[PDB]
Every structure is written in C-alpha cells, then in structure tokens.
C-alpha cells in the first residue's frame, strides 16, 4: 500500500486489513447531510427495490479502485476525486442509509 488517501483510509476504516476490497467510495459531506438523502428523490435500486433515494445535489466523493497489480497483503488503489449525486438505500427507524447503491 502506498501513501495516497485511498490506501490509508481503506486501511484505517478496516476495509483492507484482512483483504483487498476491489472498490469503495468515500463521501466528503457531513453525516447529517447524507442521512437527509433518505427523504429526497425516490428512485428504484439496482435490484429493483424502491427504497433508494438520490441526492438533489452533487456531493464531494473519492472513488477508490484496486490497481491491476494489487494483491493481498499489499493492496494498491487508484484515487479519483469527483462531485456527483449519490443514491443510497434506506431502512429502519429513524430512516437512515444502510447501503450505497451508486453515485451519478
């Protein structure tokens, strides 16, 4: 693992300590603003469920993707920064995000 944001955060958040996760997205917004998405635009999820919601606005996100040579225990990631709408699946009470369906 290098020193880029992805290699470090994937490790710190317990994603690559015992495996190399192929892809992962980190959202750079307040927790409350992401939870607010559960009452925004209702859309179908990839699996066909209707408990997904798309954010009205784009959000700051960092995409982390394993390079072609990455191999446990030396996971390596390519970091890509972008601003896009997020789609999360929500459940429970309070109605909060439990899955990241995608980013547009």
């Amino acid at each position: 693992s290098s020193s880029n944001y992805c290699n470090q955060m994937m490790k710190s958040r317990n994603l690559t300590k015992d495996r190399c996760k192929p892809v992962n997205t980190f959202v750079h917004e307040s927790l409350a603003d992401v939870q607010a998405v559960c009452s925004q635009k209702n859309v179908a999820c990839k699996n066909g469920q209707t408990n997904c919601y798309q954010s009205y606005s784009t959000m700051s996100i960092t995409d982390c993707r394993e390079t072609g040579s990455s191999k446990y225990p030396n996971c390596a990631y390519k970091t890509t920064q972008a601003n896009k709408h997020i789609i999360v699946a929500c459940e429970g009470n309070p109605y909060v995000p439990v899955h990241f369906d995608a980013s547009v």
Binding site: L15, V98, F100
Partner: peptide, 15 residues
C-alpha cells in the same frame, strides 16, 4: 455488534 447503518458510516463517510 455493528449495525448496518454504522457499517455504512465506517465504510463510506469521511466528514
């Protein structure tokens, strides 16, 4: 242990 909501925060949020 860790709820689905908490897992989502740990894996995807960086405020």
């Amino acid at each position: 242990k860790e709820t689905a909501a908490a897992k989502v925060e740990r894996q995807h949020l960086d405020s």
